Paper text:
Here, we report cryo-EM structures of a [name]-[name], [name], covering multiple transport intermediates of the E1 → E1-ATP → E1P-ADP → E1P → E2P → E2.Pi → E2 → E1 cycle. All P-type [name] share a common fold with a transmembrane (M) domain responsible for cargo transport across the membranes, and actuator (A), nucleotide binding (N), and phosphorylation (P) domains handling ATP turnover. Collectively, our findings are compatible with a broad range of proteins as cargo, with the [name]-[name] serving a role in membrane removal of helices, although insertion/secretion cannot be excluded, as well as with a mechanistic role of the Plug-domain.
Structure-based alignments of the structure to P2-, P4-, and P5-[name] indicate it resembles an E1 or E1-ATP state, which is typically associated with “inward-open” or “inward-facing occluded” configurations, respectively (RMSD 5.5, 5.0, 5.7, 2.2, and 3.0 Å to PDB-IDs 4H1W56, 3N8G57, 6K7G58, 6XMP23, and 7N7513, respectively). The identified inward-open crevice likely represents a critical aspect of the transport pathway, since the opening is overlaying the cleft of the M-domain in the E2P/E2.Pi states, and the cleft is lined by E458 and E462. However, the cavity is blocked by the C-terminal portion of the P-domain insertion, with residues 1005–1013 dipping into the membrane and inserting between M2 and M4, hence forming another link between the soluble and M-domains. The observed ability of this P-domain insertion to block the likely transport pathway in the M-domain lead us to rename it the Plug-domain and the C-terminal residues of the domain (residues 1005–1013 model, but non-sharpened maps suggest it extends beyond D1005) the Plug, the significance of which will be discussed later. The closing of the ER luminal end of the cleft would then push the helix into the cytoplasm, and following release, the cytoplasmic cavity is capped by the Plug-domain, as observed in our E1 structure.
Numbering used by the authors: 3 to 119, 125 to 356, 365 to 521, 526 to 590, 597 to 767, 776 to 887, 1005 to 1143, 1152 to 1285
The structure:
């Protein structure tokens, strides 16, 4: 019924049908008595043959058709909807619904409708959908905080919880219980699920078919090898499900204000709208569900959602305008308690008029319960991480069908040659079906999953964890690698340079008139010291730790003052005073300033000059305070521009006195508007800070730029700092031009070129050709949708001063052009941007020494994955991005080599069987068993390979169908079939014509063994991405031993081993011809594969990542210098 969800493609309504009308019952009920009448009494042998073997063939064919029609319902959902069910009229009589998700959301499934009263609902991927008759469509549940019009704060500030019992029952029926429902099945249900998959039943059918031809050991070996693998997979899945269940939070008693009483209920019956009391959490516990603080403040530790153990600070919405302010999740982000955090402290113990709870805790209001929380969604998307097996297999099936044509040609030729020589039709058909069925590889469509699960183990050694593992192949096709700033490229070990520009209006100067004289923070004025000690937002734990932004911690450490009990600072500095913060206005990231009101009492030791009373301190961006001053100085703009042009961070300080003596009063300070306070300011000075670059930034950017990628930067600072950082990190090289309002004029860094451009006209080609670009946020906003917006995303690499919405806007605009993007951020400022990109990395702040003191990868506990981005690195190194880009590049290479090996093996086996069956002879049982065991040994021995220590300019192919895989497969197959035809013809020329040994059997067996080893030796993907064949002993010895064994059996070094495989002894000349033919075959295969790899393997870089010859020359001379300095 056209459900409303971005992750669902279509829907349909069905009704169930009785067992009589199922499509796998009634036609067989019609046709079986016809066959019984024909076989029993009718004697209509015209459409028959007569033998018992043909009766067996007819019975097998009928049973096979019936069970195939039955299994087609389990294999696909469309045939399930067609054969068993049938379409209904509308929602009034339908009982079943079919849901088909988006291309990478899982597998389609038939969902059952459940009706409760009027309400129609169904469960899809553990997510509840509801039927809204006013919209005539299905959609997910709607909560009070996620309405299309955002509710005001008067909804939550005056909330009184649940007041009626029928409302409680309605909420219980609507939203359900607050728990994680993860049902774990037993071994029987999982093996039933695994035993109906098409490839398992196909392998069972192949085993039965081989057993029909009197092969007792081969079928048993295949059955054992299949059964143990399936049992291992089922046991691993069961263990993973048990571990997933084990992480659910246990219920604990809590206080809920229900029906006017503070009744104690368990934490398993929370409903959206309840008024719960938050207290300090116990050991092995946490917040039950998402909340919003309505009174008091709390200090939390969100280590189960972001992977960081740094304490935070959360504040209530108690002191906000109740109805005049619409709730926004950009300014009120410090009021929501997420489900899974641990509360560490409660500071205080109301507008709603509610008596305090008995436990003396903060009051909150529940918003989301169940899987609809954040960590609930993370758990749900980690349960269904196997989207690589279900929403896939659309190209491997085509590869199997492509091999089936080469199978059918040989089978048809064998049948046509057999019908003209008067063969028995009960054996020729079996031989043809064996030739057909010996082609389909059983482990072909699930190669990508094994490669991904192998790469995930190597990634989990540098503390890099992946939540959605289908993005690993996406990491090998990256063209644009976007970067952030202040969380990725630059660290957080800020150092206070000093206070400069405080001498204005009262002297070294430059051409522009800037004041370069800089004064240390110790020898500063009293007002500036009071502003620095007033306008912070630091709070102290009872145990002695200080929490907050590292900027405030750094400036407090540089100031020298100490932090007291309750927002009181005393005092090395020469101020010798005390302050007490009354009211605090928080930073908003859009007003670009923060302010505070405090009571001061200072006594300067140099000139006395007592000062006491109310005080207002504000600290923010220098371009915003200038709009709030009363008299700007003579050289304000030039001074702050000069001090920010060198990569330093400049903040302005302003102060205002309210009362020269005496308190303002609690009632006055409790009721003050932000706009009235932040006006009529004085000037104190500038605070200058230097953010040091990370140690790995330059190397990890120089590796990305020189390996067919492109590195852009999307920051949020002023353009001068962004340009300086990009020049230090070597992103831009030539002269840059900043596009910003002065009109959207072009500006230079030194402000010597001012070129105006109109947004309707296209930009100048010379600007795009001879200069680098830095596009701001305002200019990009004024270029939205016009003709120049397509060429402003291909020639710009530094985006400065952009909102978090514009980041995902830029990422979407870059994705819509066909490029693949990567986003690396801190995981807090931008959340939608990290998910809009193809692959997103969230670089945390943990050091290596923190990790020191504290097969698929270890299953992700709640402290390992992050809710912001799919990938997550627990180390702060920038080098974590090339590791991902190298693993995602080696995965494609491994997949390509396995695809090239399996098809060649199958095509060799089929055309060996076709050559043998034209003469009437057949393989021995021991020979084929030894061949299978040796092939399995070689497969085990070849899989142990590792990667190189650096990136490469050559990119691998991303898909099967190209001019490299197909050409190599065809060439090697043609060489092998010509070799086999020549050997068969020579053996027929030498000796003219129950299992007995013969010359042709031994010759064909030896040739096919040698070819099946040569296709392992030749088709190994080596040098550029992974370790070479000759480097490691593990596969070299394995190949050499089996090659020597086969050659020794060929030339009769050990005649005792010959009788194990039933080989007729040869003479000298035939041995010489066989050895020469083997060597010629190997050399020709190697030459063809090397030529095709040298010609067609390289996938060239895009137009956005191509370098100029100057950069190539600089890279060459830098590599030459490094090679010279290596010794």
């Amino acid at each position: 019924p056209l459900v409303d969800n971005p992750q669902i493609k279509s829907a349909e309504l069905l009704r169930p049908l009785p067992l009589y009308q199922h499509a796998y019952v009634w036609p067989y009920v019609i046709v079986w008595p016809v066959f019984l009448r024909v076989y029993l009494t009718q004697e209509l042998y015209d459409k028959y043959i007569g033998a018992q073997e043909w009766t067996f063939v007819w019975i097998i064919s009928i049973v096979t058709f019936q069970t195939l029609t039955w299994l087609c319902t389990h294999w696909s959902v469309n045939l399930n909807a067609l054969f068993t069910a049938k379409k209904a009229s509308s929602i009034e009589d339908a009982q079943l619904i079919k849901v088909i998700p988006v291309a990478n959301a899982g597998a389609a499934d038939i969902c059952k409708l459940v009706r409760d009263k009027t309400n129609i609902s169904f469960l899809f991927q553990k997510r509840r959908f509801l039927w809204y008759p006013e919209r005539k469509a299905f959609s997910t549940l709607e909560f009070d905080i996620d309405a299309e019009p955002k509710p005001t704060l008067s909804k939550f500030q005056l909330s009184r919880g649940i007041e009626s019992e029928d409302e409680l029952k309605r909420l219980e029926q609507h939203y359900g219980t607050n728990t994680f429902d993860i049902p774990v099945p037993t071994f029987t249900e999982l093996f039933k699920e695994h035993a109906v998959a098409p490839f398992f039943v196909f392998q069972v059918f192949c085993v039965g078919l081989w057993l029909l031809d009197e092969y007792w050991y081969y079928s048993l070996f295949t059955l054992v090898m299949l059964v143990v693998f399936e049992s291992t997979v089922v046991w691993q899945r069961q263990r993973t499900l048990t571990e997933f269940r084990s992480m659910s939070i246990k219920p604990y008693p809590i206080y809920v204000y229900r029906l006017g009483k503070w009744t104690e209920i368990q934490s398993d019956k929370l409903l959206p709208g309840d008024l719960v009391s938050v207290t300090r959490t116990k050991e092995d516990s946490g917040v039950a569900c998402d909340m919003i603080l309505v009174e008091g403040t709390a200090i939390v530790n969100e280590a189960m959602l972001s992977g960081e153990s740094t304490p935070l600070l959360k504040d209530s919405i108690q002191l906000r305008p109740g109805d005049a302010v619409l709730e926004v999740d950009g300014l009120d982000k410090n009021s929501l308690l997420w489900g899974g955090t641990k509360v560490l402290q409660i500071t205080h113990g109301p507008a709603s008029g509610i008596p305090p709870p008995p436990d003396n805790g903060a009051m909150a209001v529940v918003t989301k319960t169940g899987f609809e929380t954040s960590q609930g969604s993370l758990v749900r998307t980690m349960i269904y991480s196997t989207e690589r097996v279900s929403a896939n297999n659309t190209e491997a099936l085509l590869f199997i069908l492509f091999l089936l044509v080469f199978a059918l040609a040989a089978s048809w030729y064998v049948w046509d040659e057999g019908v003209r020589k008067d063969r028995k039709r009960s054996k020729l058909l079996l031989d043809c079906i064996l030739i057909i069925t010996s082609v389909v590889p059983p482990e072909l469509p699930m190669e990508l999953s094994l490669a991904v699960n192998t790469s995930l183990s190597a990634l989990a050694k540098f503390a890099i964890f992946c939540t959605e593992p289908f993005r690993i192949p996406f990491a090998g096709r990256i063209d644009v690698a976007c970067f952030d700033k202040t969380g990725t490229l630059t660290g957080e070990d800020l150092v206070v340079e000093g206070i400069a520009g405080l001498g204005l209006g009262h002297t070294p100067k430059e051409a522009d008139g800037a004041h370069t004289r800089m004064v240390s923070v110790h020898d500063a004025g009293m007002e500036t010291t009071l502003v620095l000690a007033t306008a912070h937002a630091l709070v102290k734990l009872d145990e002695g730790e200080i929490v907050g932004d590292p900027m405030e911690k750094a400036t407090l450490n540089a100031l020298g003052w100490v932090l007291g009990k309750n927002d009181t600072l005393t005092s090395s500095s020469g101020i010798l005073g005390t302050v007490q913060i009354k009211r605090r206005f928080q930073f908003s990231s859009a007003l670009k300033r923060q302010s505070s009101v405090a009571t001061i009492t200072a006594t300067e030791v140099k000139t006395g000059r007592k000062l006491r009373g109310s005080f207002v301190g504000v600290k923010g961006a220098p371009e915003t305070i200038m709009k709030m001053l009363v008299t700007v100085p003579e050289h304000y703009e030039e001074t702050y521009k000069y001090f920010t042009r060198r990569g330093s961070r400049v903040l302005a300080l302003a102060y205002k006195q309210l009362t020269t003596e005496g308190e303002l009063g609690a009632n006055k300070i409790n009721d003050l508007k932000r706009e009235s306070v932040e006006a009529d300011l004085h000037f104190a000075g500038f605070l200058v800070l230097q953010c040091p670059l990370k140690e790995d930034a330059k190397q990890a950017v120089r590796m990305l730029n020189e390996s067919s990628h492109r590195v852009v930067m999307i920051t949020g600072d002023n353009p001068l700092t962004a340009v300086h950082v990009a020049k230090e990190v070597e992103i831009v090289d030539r002269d840059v031009l900043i596009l910003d309002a002065p009109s959207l004029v072009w500006r230079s860094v030194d402000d010597k070129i001012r070129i105006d451009v109109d947004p309707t006209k296209p930009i100048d080609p010379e600007i795009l050709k001879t200069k680098d670009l830095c596009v701001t946020g305002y200019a990009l906003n004024k270029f939205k949708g016009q003709v120049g917006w397509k060429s402003l995303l291909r020639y710009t690499w530094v985006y400065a001063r952009v909102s978090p919405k514009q980041k995902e806007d830029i990422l979407l605009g870059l994705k819509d052009m066909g490029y693949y993007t990567l986003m690396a951020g801190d995981g807090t400022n931008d959340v939608g941007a990290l998910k809009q990109a193809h692959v997103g990395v969230a670089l945390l702040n943990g050091t290596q020494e923190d990790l020191n003191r504290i097969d698929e990868p270890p299953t992700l506990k709640l402290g390992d994955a992050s809710v912001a981005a799919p990938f997550t690195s627990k180390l702060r190194n920038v080098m974590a991005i090339p590791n991902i880009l190298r693993q995602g590049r080696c995965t494609l290479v491994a997949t390509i080599q396995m695809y090239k090996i399996l098809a060649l093996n199958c095509l060799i086996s089929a055309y060996s069987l076709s050559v043998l069956y034209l003469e009437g002879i057949k393989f021995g049982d021991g020979q084929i068993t030894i061949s299978g065991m040796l092939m399995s040994v070689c497969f085990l021995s070849i899989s142990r390979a590792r990667s190189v220590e650096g990136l490469s300019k050559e990119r691998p192919q991303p898909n099967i169908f190209n001019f490299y895989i197909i050409g190599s497969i065809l060439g090697q197959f043609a060489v092998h079939v010509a070799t086999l035809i020549y050997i068969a013809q020579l053996c027929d020329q030498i000796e003219p014509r129950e299992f007995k040994p013969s010359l042709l059997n031994s010759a064909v067996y030896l040739l096919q063994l040698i070819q099946q080893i040569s296709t392992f030796a030749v088709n190994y993907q080596g040098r550029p991405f992974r370790e070479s064949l000759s480097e490691n002993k593990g596969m070299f010895y394995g190949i050499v031993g089996v090659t020597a064994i086969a050659f020794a059996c060929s030339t009769e070094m050990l005649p005792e081993l010959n009788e194990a495989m039933k080989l007729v002894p040869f003479n000298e000349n035939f041995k010489t011809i066989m050895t020469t033919v083997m060597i010629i075959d190997f050399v020709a295969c190697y030459v063809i594969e090397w030529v095709l790899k040298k010609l067609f393997s390289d996938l060239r870089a895009r137009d956005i990542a191509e370098r100029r010859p100057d950069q190539l020359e600089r890279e060459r001379v830098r590599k030459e210098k490094e090679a010279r300095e290596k010794e």
